[PDB]
Structure formats: structure tokens, C-alpha cells
């Protein structure tokens, strides 16, 4: 809503989106949304420090034609409130791969089968400093 929105990204399979930002000292959560547009998201990436009953959990989901998909959570949580955080995303036909701080990586199934990622929105307690394409 107040976070950075970017469109016409034209990110193709195998290309790296690198995002760096500042996690607020009192962060509750933040969101990186990636897909075609606000209703069609091949990845909703939502680290929760303390939000919706979740402590230090990464929640991921997709959104297809307005409808949220089946949620998935990861065990690993390498984000700290009040510090700078970089996240690196790529995709292929089968999966999105997200590489985190501390060398941590995980896959989320690609559920939309889009030609490219064209849309990104940040929200929550995360101030983007830097976005790069590779």
C-alpha cells in the first residue's frame, strides 16, 4: 500500500532479482509479492517476526485470480529486526528459488506457469534500499 511497487520487470527464468532492505527495529512482518499483478502472484513471501500467531516463521503462498493458494512454512528464520537484509530470487518452470542471508536457500513450487515475473510489491516493516537485476 505504501511500499515500493515495480512493474514491467520482465524477469525471465534463470535471471536473478536481488532486493536489499532495512528491517525496522520493531518489525512484525514484511512482504515481498512477485508475479503478474496484485491478483496473480507466483510468490507471496512473508517473514513473520510476530504476526497472526506466528513467531519467527517464513510463510509463503501464491495467489491465482484473486484466490490465495495453500500456505507453506519454512523452519529456518535468518532475519533479525533492526538490520539490513538481502533476498535473492530466481525461477524455472517447476520452482521459485529464494536465497536468504546465512546461505539459506529454499524452493517454492511455481504454481502459475507465467512466462516472466513482471510485478513486484514490497510491504510491511521493510524499507527497500536497493533492487538489482542480473
Ligand X SMILES: OC[C@H]1O[C@@H](S[C@@H]2O[C@H](CO)[C@H](O)[C@H](n3cc(-c4ccsc4)nn3)[C@H]2O)[C@H](O)[C@@H](n2cc(-c3ccsc3)nn2)[C@H]1O
Binding-site residue numbers are 44-48, 52, 61, 68-71
Which one of 24, 31, 128, 131 is in contact with ligand X (CB under 6 A)? 31
Residues of span 102-131 touching a second copy by CB under 8 A:
128-131
- Is residue 23 within 8 A of residue 122, CB to CB? The reply is no
Q: From the list ligand X, a second copy, none, pick the one residue 9 interacts with, judged by a Cβ distance below 5 to 8 Å according to partner type.
A: a second copy
User: What is the DSSP code string of 7-58?
Assistant: EEEEEPTTPPEEEEEEEPTT--BEEEEEEEETTEEEEEEEEEEEETTEEEEE
**Does 62 interact with ligand X (rule: CB under 6 A)?**
no
Residue 52 found at the interface with ligand X (CB under 6 A): yes
Amino acid at each position: 500500500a505504501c511500499g515500493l511497487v515495480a512493474s514491467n520487470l520482465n524477469l525471465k527464468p534463470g535471471e536473478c532479482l536481488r532486493v536489499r532492505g532495512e528491517v525496522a527495529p520493531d518489525a512484525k512482518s514484511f512482504v515481498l509479492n512477485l508475479g503478474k499483478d496484485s491478483n496473480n502472484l507466483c510468490l507471496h513471501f512473508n517473514p513473520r517476526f510476530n504476526a497472526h500467531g506466528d513467531a519467527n516463521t517464513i510463510v509463503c503462498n501464491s495467489k491465482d485470480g484473486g484466490a490465495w493458494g495453500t500456505e507453506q512454512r519454512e523452519a529456518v528464520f535468518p532475519f533479525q529486526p533492526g538490520s539490513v537484509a538481502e533476498v535473492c530470487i530466481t525461477f524455472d518452470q517447476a520452482n521459485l528459488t529464494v536465497k536468504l542471508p546465512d546461505g539459506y536457500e529454499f524452493k517454492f513450487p511455481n504454481r502459475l506457469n507465467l512466462e516472466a515475473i513482471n510485478y513486484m510489491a514490497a510491504d510491511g516493516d521493510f524499507k527497500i534500499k536497493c533492487v538489482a537485476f542480473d
